[PDB]
Amino acid sequence: ACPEDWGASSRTSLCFKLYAKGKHEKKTWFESRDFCRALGGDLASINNKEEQQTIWRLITASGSYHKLFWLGLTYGSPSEGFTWSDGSPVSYENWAYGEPNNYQNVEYCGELKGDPTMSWNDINCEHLNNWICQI
Numbered sequence: 001a002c003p004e005d006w007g008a009s010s011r012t013s014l015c016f017k018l019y020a021k022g023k024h025e026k027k028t029w030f031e032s033r034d035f036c037r038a039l040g041g042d043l044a045s046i047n048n049k050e051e052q053q054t055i056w057r058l059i060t061a062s063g064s065y066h067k068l069f070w071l072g073l074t075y076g077s078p079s080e081g082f083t084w085s086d087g088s089p090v091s092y093e094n095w096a097y098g099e100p101n102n103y104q105n106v107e108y109c110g111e112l113k114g115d116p117t118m119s120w121n122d123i124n125c126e127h128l129n130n131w132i133c134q135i
C-alpha cells in the first residue's frame, strides 16, 4: 500500500509524487535527490511500462503538460553508463530519439518530458527542474 497522495492501497501499488514548482522553487538533480531521500524515498525510478503509465496518469491529473521532471537517472562509471539512484537496474528505457547523447559532454542526469511520449533526455545536472519522488 502507498501513503496518502502517493498511490493506491493494493500490495502491487507503486508510489510516486510529482513536484511541479515555479522557477524559484525548482531544484538541481542533487537537490531533488536529497529532498526525496529526506522523506525516506528517492527520485523516481521507472522500472517498466507499468510505472511509466502510473506517472503519466499522475501528470494528466495535474492539468499541466510539457513540463520537465528529474528522474533518478544519474550517470555512473563510463562502463556503467546511466544508473538509477535507488540502485535498481536500468532494465527498461524510454530515451527520446538519439538520447542519451551527452551533448557537449556535460549531461550526466536524466529528465522526463511530461508529455504523452514520456521520453527521457540526459541533461546537465545543475539545471533547475521539477522532480518526481517515489517512496
Ligand SMILES: CC(=O)N[C@@H]1[C@@H](O[C@@H]2O[C@@H](C)[C@@H](O)[C@@H](O)[C@@H]2O)[C@H](O)[C@@H](CO)O[C@H]1O
Pocket (backbone or CB within 6 Å): 097, 098, 099, 101, 103, 107, 121, 122, 123
Ligand atoms: C537527439 C540529439 O542528439 N539532439 C541534439 C541536441 O541536443 C538536445 O537538445 C539540447 C537543447 C539538450 O536538451 C540536449 O540534452 C538534447 O540532447 C543538440 O542541441 C543539437 C545541437 O545542434 O544537436 C542535436 O542532434
Ligand SMILES: [Ca+2]
Pocket (backbone or CB within 6 Å): 099, 100, 101, 102, 103, 107, 121, 122, 123
Ligand atoms: Ca541529451
